[PDB]
Design a protein around this ligand. Sequence first.
Ligand SMILES: [Zn+2]
Ligand SMILES: [Zn+2]
Lengths: 121, 121
Amino acid sequence: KENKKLLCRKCKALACYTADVRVIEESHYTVLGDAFKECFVSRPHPKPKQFSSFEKRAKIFCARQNCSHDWGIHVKYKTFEIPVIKIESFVVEDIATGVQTLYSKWKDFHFEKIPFDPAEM
Amino acid sequence: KENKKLLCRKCKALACYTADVRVIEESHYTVLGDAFKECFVSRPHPKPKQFSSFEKRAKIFCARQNCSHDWGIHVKYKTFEIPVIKIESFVVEDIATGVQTLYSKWKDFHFEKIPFDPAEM
RNA sequence: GGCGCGCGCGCGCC
RNA sequence: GGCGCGCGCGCGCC
Ligand SMILES: [Zn+2]
Ligand SMILES: [Zn+2]
């Protein structure tokens, strides 16, 4: 499907394109590349936890000046440390139309969901 | 689906039975008979209104003096002056067992919902 | 995160 | 009464 842009629900800054998105265990979403790294800052999770395949360690936020909108978490997965985002904190913008959409749950946003991959990393 | 007793949620007093209840226009619950009239007291309605075919004429409360728990309102439905109750002010007691259930909305409470019938007065 | 839920206050309509 | 919604707090498992 059409590649799309995820912008902070709050400031509207560009976070990533679904192109760089990956799915884990069909329900957890993360973003590839250092580029996405410069886009958020993480911070010690007040109530870390271990569930399924992760150790929820940090809480992440939009890395821009006066927004710091909670974008989700940062976790240890296998031997990787990675961000796991929640579609609710972003706005999906269609590239060829500008149309924007607010999703609350990932199941509702139907785009090409490529499973997370070790090889790539 | 059996006959249950309705009890004032706050003081536990007997208000009425489910066999006496009747549903007006699928959303409002009144009570037939004199017994139920010996159970509540009416008082001026703080801010009368007028929704659909009803007109708020008063607030009704549990009769037991030391209780006075709000049970709902009293309205004019067509040519009738009748009490309209909200299950949330009551405790539904199963007659055989004593088992009591707290509901906040009438839709969640499943029993034989006999419709208001003018013939019955 | 994902899933589900509880609570507090605010608003509108019939 | 009944229904729809907004904002914010918290809980559980996995
Ligand atoms: Zn932002
Ligand atoms: Zn009472």
